Amino acid sequence: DARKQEIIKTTEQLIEAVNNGDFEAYAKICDPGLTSFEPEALGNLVEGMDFHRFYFENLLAKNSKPIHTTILNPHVHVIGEDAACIAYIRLTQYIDGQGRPRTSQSEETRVWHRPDGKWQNVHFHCSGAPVAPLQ
Amino acid sequence: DARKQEIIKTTEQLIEAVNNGDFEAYAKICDPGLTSFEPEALGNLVEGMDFHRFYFENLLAKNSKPIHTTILNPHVHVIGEDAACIAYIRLTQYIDGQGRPRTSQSEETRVWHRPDGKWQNVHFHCSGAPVAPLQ
Amino acid sequence: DARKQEIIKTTEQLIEAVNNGDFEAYAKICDPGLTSFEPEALGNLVEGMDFHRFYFENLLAKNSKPIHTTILNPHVHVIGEDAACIAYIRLTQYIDGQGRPRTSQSEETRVWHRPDGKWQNVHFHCSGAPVAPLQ
Amino acid sequence: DARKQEIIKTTEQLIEAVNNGDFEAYAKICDPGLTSFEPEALGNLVEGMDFHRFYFENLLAKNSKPIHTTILNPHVHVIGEDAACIAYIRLTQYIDGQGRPRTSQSEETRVWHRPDGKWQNVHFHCSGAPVAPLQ
Amino acid sequence: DARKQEIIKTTEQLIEAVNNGDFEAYAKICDPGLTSFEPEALGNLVEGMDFHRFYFENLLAKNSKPIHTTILNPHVHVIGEDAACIAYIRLTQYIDGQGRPRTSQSEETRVWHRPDGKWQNVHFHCSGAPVAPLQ
Amino acid sequence: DARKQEIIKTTEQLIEAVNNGDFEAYAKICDPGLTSFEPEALGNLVEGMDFHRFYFENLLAKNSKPIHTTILNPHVHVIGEDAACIAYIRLTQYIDGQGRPRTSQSEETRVWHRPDGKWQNVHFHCSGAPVAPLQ
Amino acid sequence: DARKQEIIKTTEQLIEAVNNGDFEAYAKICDPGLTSFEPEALGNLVEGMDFHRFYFENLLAKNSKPIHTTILNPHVHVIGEDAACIAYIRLTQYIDGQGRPRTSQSEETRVWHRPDGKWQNVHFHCSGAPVAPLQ
Amino acid sequence: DARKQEIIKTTEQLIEAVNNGDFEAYAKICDPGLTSFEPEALGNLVEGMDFHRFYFENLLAKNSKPIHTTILNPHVHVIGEDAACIAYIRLTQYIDGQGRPRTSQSEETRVWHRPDGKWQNVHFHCSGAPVAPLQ
Amino acid sequence: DARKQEIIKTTEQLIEAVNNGDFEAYAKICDPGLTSFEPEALGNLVEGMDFHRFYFENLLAKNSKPIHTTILNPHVHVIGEDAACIAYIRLTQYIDGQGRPRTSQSEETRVWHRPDGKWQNVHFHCSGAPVAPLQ
Amino acid sequence: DARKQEIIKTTEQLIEAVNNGDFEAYAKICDPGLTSFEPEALGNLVEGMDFHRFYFENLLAKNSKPIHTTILNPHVHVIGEDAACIAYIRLTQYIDGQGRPRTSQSEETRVWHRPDGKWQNVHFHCSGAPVAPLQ
Amino acid sequence: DARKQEIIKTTEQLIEAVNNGDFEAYAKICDPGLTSFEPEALGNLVEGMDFHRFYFENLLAKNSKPIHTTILNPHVHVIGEDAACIAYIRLTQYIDGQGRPRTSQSEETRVWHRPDGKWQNVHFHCSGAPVAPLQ
Amino acid sequence: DARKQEIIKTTEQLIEAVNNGDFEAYAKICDPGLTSFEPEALGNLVEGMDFHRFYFENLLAKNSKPIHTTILNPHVHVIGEDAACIAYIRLTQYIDGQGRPRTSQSEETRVWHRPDGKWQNVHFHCSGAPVAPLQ
């Protein structure tokens, strides 16, 4: 359970670096060849950092309204000593463009490798609501 | 490229065992603790074989109409010697309940481990069209 | 955990007596003053057995098609020695009126009392899909 | 009828502490392990206080417009001396974001335990309109 | 409570004479100048028996499928010794044109007079679902 | 026709006391145990004055725009000397939230008793448009 | 009232000649230069018999199912000794293409002249449901 | 053709008195017992001046924007020397609530009598767009 | 008026040759370079006979059900001695694919030239319903 | 081709006089008995100048925003020496009520005569988008 | 114009080989590395013959109903002596799944190369209606 | 691969000249007889520069908000030494009319010729989202 709690802790560091808009910390968690599927990419497989960079510069660095996030039913597969995978449900509570509280759901998969003693993310898949909020 | 072609070959064996309705071969490719996200599970994370078993018994063992499948733009991450991940776009051509040809798209992620010298699947995530066909 | 497994076992006996259409076993699990909220009652609070009796006589005793049910994330509150409450997510896999497999979800609460040494159900609440199937 | 009037009185204290935005009184009525089903949680079972805390901080502490609430057809099950359950219909009259009066309906179940001589809430289930108002 | 139970009993005789298709008994319960509002009359006030006669001749005398009816929360006003009024919610369980069980709701008011020692109906108002079933 | 004109006159006094917002005159026309069905109550049977009080305090005491009302095809049943019933179509002409004239229709039933020499209202049923105007 | 009852009687002869499919009697009631507005003419003013002839030949001579018609609130203007006008609401009860009873409403104006001692129809206007039934 | 041109001229005087908002001239053209069918009356037959008075006071006396009206294909029936009927298509060109030109269509019937040497209107029927404009 | 009646007569010969399915007579009325706009051509300008030929071969030669056509408000421009233009509204009464009478409207323009002593059609424009019927 | 270029040139003079709002030049191109079909006339045949005059006075004399027009695939029929007909597709590029560029399509027919040595327009037919722009 | 007529002729040979279902002639016109965009491929770029092969085997070899095709406004770019490009509008007239004639439109681009003395197709792009017909 | 990288480089120069609003550089890349299919042209084939000029003058020269563009899966056909064709998927990230980031997809084909030693564009085809952004 010690190695599973380590993957959980490192995944929580990713999620709070994203919602802080901290792109310089996000870039240290991600591999340069990272690939992803997500609702914003319209069914295409994205590669590298530059597609995601646009949302840090146009939302996450600029926003100020309160947000709360719940992680439900996490499951971890540990795949030897170099590799791991985590899957969870995410609920986000947020304030819309006219002051009403709202909720949305996503389903997320993250794939982790340990090159050079540090855990880094190599592939990501998301379903459900967009991460760009529906305000 | 040799190890990447091996993951491609093993992923093609999974896809043809599914569309043949060969549940006894499917059960040798999958780990007993396998987890999944897919459109049929309504946003929930499924564990084990028994949710999928229902579709082999009520479609895949019984169907006879022609189907064709195209795999587009595959990408493989090889994660040491025990682990790998593959991501691809899938297009399926099928005949509906009244003889008309149709097309649908999915986006798929599969996570592979090599316990006891044999590659086996430990997590799967699907977006887009259901695998239960829209006939 | 022994008393929690007992409530789980007794709740599984209720669910299989319903999907067998066994109204004479259902009547031994329920209290005569049982109350319920469910989608079929259109927002009203029902009392007694006679509202439910209609669905045993017009579906559950007559149906023959295959059904599978998954219970997800159960939680039990044990409230002294006489009382308990259980909450769970239910997924049902079923065949429609033209041979296609389908899925639906409900959320369920059940309240249990132990009069005369036997566990019996006194209140029930359901949300999501109707239990009368969407075939 | 004396013990039933006591559960009614305590349920009315909960409802007025919520619509006053009095989170410090709400926290004394609820057990720390409380679970719930409600429309805002999107079909998931919530545990603990922190999901509900967001609506006290972003609505109930800040609102000033007039509200009226009617409780219809309450039913109480008393389950020995430590335990009780209550079920009722709730109608709420409220003013929208442009000054028009509106109405909405919910159906609610609440499960009560008496640890250490004080009644506290251990499970809650809601159907119908959200508690976050449709202004 | 004796006179209220008499109005309840006489109202149950009306409802079962209607669902039996017994127009010759219905004609003995109704005053010749009876007026009504109901969904089938498109917002108009009907007078006399001949508008209702059409539904006995084209449904109620001819139907054979099982029907169940629940009366909820009845209230009676007794207005001296010659007059009374009753108000109730009606739920009807029925089988559709393809064998599926269904539910519908109406709200009903009935006004009763005692000319010549016999109770007879002088005005009726219905809201909600039509009495002609939605099969 | 003299007693019928008296019920008509008293019903017109009710309608103008409501559209003046005169809740202290409305309370002298109504019995303390009065019951009603209306579109604002969402299919439920309301009892007493406090549900209606909210619309006097949040509209009828505060409004200033011109309104005109037409009563069509009234019918009266006189039920001995203590009791009467009246039924009519109501058309209301009103100005919306942006200065355009509009029309709406309701169908209404009212039940009258004469305790202590004064006519008072004991039950009411409404269908069609809400009495809260669609501005 | 004698001359008004004569216009009513002659208008009832027209309506029953139409629903019998008796085009040879209809042609004796109508002036050769008769004009009309009705839903079937798509906003145009029709002149003469030949537009209406098509509905006698393709429905009214061929139909066999039961129909009932109610005339509501008739008003007559008598305009000297040669001329009259009548206006009424019409409700029609009919059976659809699969055996269910249905209702529809129209509003109708008819203009009458007495050339050569016989009343004949010179202009007609209809609003609401089409006369061609919605089976 | 002289008597037909007289009815045309008098009908044009009505139409321009209405669009000027000249209710004191309108009241001299209409009979005190005039009846009408029109889209604003929701399927009911109106009698007298007071329903129409509301639109003079809340639009026609207050408006200032340009309007143009075309009368198409008029037909006149002259019914002895005391009575006449006219039927026509009306097209209205108008400016909406945000400055765009718009068009709408009605179909109209008007019935005229000559009491005391002066032509006056006794019945009116309208179909298509409301006369209260769709701005 | 003699030359206008000649264009009317020749236009009626075209319309009855079309609804008879008489393509060999249609080909004698049309110029070889004829152009047209119509709903079936999806906004394109068609040239020559071969686009129209398909509807003679697949409907007009094969149909048997009764059809009636009304021509409304025709207008003719005569343009010297060689040339003419006609414009009219067309109403068609027809029986649908399940035996119900239906109506549809078109607006039509036709341009006529007299080469070699015989009138022939050189351009046609249609708006409204398709001539291929909505059965 | 010289006479065809003359009709093209004169048709371009009409189109630019319209979009300049130059009603005094438009009136010299049109014959006083001109007829038209267009979307703004709701399926009716218009005659003379006064229907079109309203759009010069309420838009074309007042507008200032940039517009561009493309004429596609023109075809000309020359019908002796006094008469001609032209048909074309028209695309219009325009700025909406909030500054965004938009496109729309019409199909147009125009009929030309040469009385007194000057070409003038006698009939016009339009389909597709209205000439009043959809800003 | 000789080389342009050659590209037109070769493009007509492709279109008739497709609608004959002649896959062995289609394979001689296409380059082995051919790429395409079309509505059936859901926004993806297809490569090679095997995606198209499915529609020959499941429609074009099996169909028997009459089809007609019009090519509108073709444009050819000739790019030295080895290469050419053609663009056209295509209208297809066809019979649906219940015997009614229908029309649909596509816009098509085709790119041609002359390796080894024979013209062959290297890229294709289609917009508008699918080539799999909407029967 | 050198000649393919040259076509890629020249295609990237076109795309950045367009999103800079640099119409004087765009005019040096395009042939004077260039043809195109695109969503803005409503299914028509455009020729020359003047249709596109309108979007430079009314958007691209005036806009200031941030935009990002991704080119996916490019494919090049090189057709001797004078000619080439390129096909790709384009994703655009942009800010809407109220500050929210958005995504859209197009599929694009471009045909290139080398007259006088300089590459120039002769035909273009686009599917999917309009190039005028959906803000």
Contact C125, C37 (CB under 8 A): yes
Q: How far is L79 from chain J (nearest CA, A)?
A: 32
Distance (Å, rounded) from C-alpha I55 to C-alpha A79? 68
Neighbours of chain C (3+ CB pairs under 8 A): B, D, E
Q: What tokens does G69 get?
A: 């018609």
Query: In a 3-state reduction of DSSP, which class is residue I38?
Result: coil
Structure tokens at A29: 């968690």
List the structure tokens of L6. Answer: 């040259």
State how far the Cα of F108 lies from the Cα of F88, in Å rounded to an integer: 6
Helix (H, G, I), strand (E, B) or coil at K29: helix
Report d(CA E116, CA E82) in Å as an integer. Answer: 10
I59 vs K91, K98, K101: nearest CB: K101
**By the CB < 8 Å criterion, does K134 face chain B?**
no
Within 8 A by CB and 6+ apart from L48, the residues are: L32, L33, L34
- For residues J121 and J111, is the Cβ–Cβ distance under 8 A? yes
Question: What is the β-pairing status of strands G46-47 and E120-128?
Answer: unpaired
d(CA I17, CA I11) in angstroms, rounded, equals: 10
Is F54 in contact with D101 (Cβ distance < 8 A)?
yes
Torsion of CA D75, D80, D84, D87, to 10 degrees: -20
Are K103 and I40 contacting, i.e. CB atoms less than 8 angstroms apart?
yes
d(CA E130, CA D116): 54
Pairwise CA distance, residues F72 & F90, whole Å: 6
d(CA F55, CA F131): 10
Among residues A124, A92, A130, A129, which one has the least CA distance to residue A108? A124
Helix (H, G, I), strand (E, B) or coil at I35: strand
Distance from C-alpha of J117 to C-alpha of G76, rounded to nearest angstrom: 62
Reduced to 3 states, what is the DSSP secondary structure of residue G72? strand
**φ/ψ of residue G96, rounded to 5:** -75, -175
By what technique were these coordinates determined?
A: cryo-EM
Contacts of I27 by beta carbon, 8 Å cutoff, 6+ apart = I49
Helix (H) or strand (E) holding L14: helix L2-19
Resolution in Å, one decimal place: 2.6
Under 8 Å between Cβ of E105 and E91: yes
Q: Are D119 and D78 in contact (CB under 8 A)?
A: no
Structure-block tokens of residue K95: 């019979």
Tell me, what DSSP letter sits at residue A40?
Answer: G
Are G110 and G85 in contact by the 8 Å Cβ rule? The answer is: yes
Q: Give how far Cα G83 sits from Cα of G79, G111, H119, Å.
A: 5, 8, 15
Residue D117, Cβ density class (10 Å: 0-12 exposed, 13-18 middle, ≥19 buried): exposed
* Contact partners, residue G123, CB within 8 Å, separation at least 6: G34, G35, G36, G109, G110, G111, H77, H85, H87, H109
Alpha helices in chain I, H assignment, sequence order: 2-19, 23-29, 50-55
Cα–Cα distance measured from residue D127 to residue D109, given in angstroms and rounded to the nearest whole number: 9
Rounded Cα gap, residues A66 and G5, in angstroms: 77
Task: Report chain E residues whose CB lies below 8 A from the CB of C132.
Answer: 100-101
CA dihedral C12, C15, C20, C23 (to 10 degrees): 110
Give the span between the Cα atoms of J55 and I118, in whole angstroms. Answer: 41
Contact at CB, C54 and E68, closer than 8 angstroms:
yes
Of J101, J104, J105, the CB nearest to L59: J101
In terms of Cβ atoms closer than 10 Å to its own Cβ (0-12, 13-18, 19+), residue J28 is: exposed
Does L132 lie at the interface with J, CB-CB under 8 angstroms? yes
E contact test, residue of C42, C57, C64 with most E CBs within 10 A: C42
Q: Which of H72, H69, H114 is nearest to H89 (CA)?
A: H72
Mutate to test the interface with C, among E68, E72, E103, E106 (most CBs of C within 10 A): E103
The amino acid at residue A49 is M
- The Cα–Cα gap between H43 and H36 comes to 10
Chains that touch A (3 or more CB pairs under 8 A): B, D, L
> Is the C-alpha dihedral spanning J55, J56, J57, J63 positive or negative?
positive
Fold (topology level) of L2-128: Nuclear Transport Factor 2; Chain: A, (3.10.450)
Rounded CA separation L4/C53 (Å): 75
- Concatenated DSSP letters for I80-108? SSSEEEEEEEEEEEEE-TTS-EEEEEEEE
Instruction: Tell me which residue in A44, A55, A97 faces L101 most closely, judged by beta carbons.
Output: A55
Q: Furthest-apart CA pair in chain B: how many Å?
A: 49
Put simply, the chain I residues between 51 and 80 with a CB less than 8 A from any chain G CB are 66, 68, 70, 72
Q: What is the token pair recorded at C121?
A: 């159900």
What is the number of residues in chain C? Answer: 135
DSSP string, E19-76: HTT-HHHHHHHEEEEEEEE-GGGTT--EESSHHHHHHIIIIITT--S-EEEEEEEEEE
Distance CA B85, CA I8 (A): 78
How far apart CA H12 and CA H35 sit, in angstroms, is: 20
Candidate from H41, H58, H135 with C-beta closest to F66? H58
With CB atoms and an 8 Å threshold, state whether L103 touches A57. no
- The shortest C-alpha distance from A44 to chain B (Å) reads 8
* Rounded Cα distance, A110 and A13, in Å: 13
Residue A43, Ramachandran bin (φ over 0: left; ψ between -120 and 50: alpha; else beta) = left
Cα–Cα dist H35/H49, whole Å: 9
State residue H6 phi and psi, 5-degree precision: -65, -45
CA distance C113 to C30: 10
How, if at all, do strands H30-37 and C120-128 pair?
Answer: unpaired
Beta carbons of G44 and I89 less than 8 angstroms apart: yes
What sign does the CA torsion over D40, D41, D42, D45 have?
A: negative
**Contact (CB, 8 A) for I34 and I122:** yes
Give exposure, A37-68, as e/b (b: 16+ Cβ within 10 Å). bbbbbebbbbeeeebbebbbebbbeeeeeeeb
CA-derived radius of gyration, chain E: 15
User: Using only C-alpha atoms, what is the Rg of chain G?
Assistant: 15
DSSP string covering A101-114 = EEEEEEEEEEEEE-
Measuring CA to CA, which residue among I86, I101, I91 is closest to residue I71? I91
- Report DSSP letters for A11-32, one per residue: HHHHHHHHHTT-HHHHHHHEEE
| DSSP of chain B | -HHHHHHHHHHHHHHHHHHTT-HHHHHHHEEEEEEEE-GGGTT--EESSHHHHHHIIIIITT--S-EEEEEEEEEEEE-SSSEEEEEEEEEEEEE-TTS-EEEEEEEEEEEEE-GGGS-EEEEEEEEES-SS---
Q: Are J83 and I80 in contact (CB under 8 A)?
A: yes
Alpha-carbon span B124 to A85, nearest angstrom: 11
CB I29 within 8 A of CB I13: yes
CA distance H79 to I78: 38
SS3 (DSSP) at H43: coil
Smallest CA-to-CA distance from J30 within J108, J114, J122, J110 is with J122
C-alpha distance from B82 to closest chain K C-alpha (Å): 34
Q: Which amino acid is at F76?
A: V
For residue I72, give the nearest of G44, G54, G58 by CB distance.
G44
Say how many C-beta atoms besides its own lie within 10 A of residue F20's C-beta.
14
Residue F101 contacts residue F28 (beta carbons within 8 Å): no
D-chain residues near C88 (CB < 8 A): 45
In the beta sheet, which residues pair with residue H121? H30, H112
Cβ-count burial of F87 within 10 angstroms (0-12 exposed, 13-18 middle, 19+ buried)?
Answer: buried
Whether G8 and G76 have beta carbons less than 8 Å apart is answered as: yes
Distance from the Cα of residue K29 to its chain's centroid: 11
The alpha carbon of E9 is separated from its chain's Cα centroid by a whole number of angstroms, namely 13
What is the rounded CA–CA span in Å between residue A14 and residue A23? 10
**Cross-strand pairs, J75:** J87
Amino acid identity at E60: L
Tokens of E130: 């039509």
* I93 vs I97: CA distance, rounded Å: 14
Question: CA-to-CA distance for E104 and E130, rounded, in angstroms?
Answer: 9
DSSP code of C90? E
CA distance F92 to F101: 10
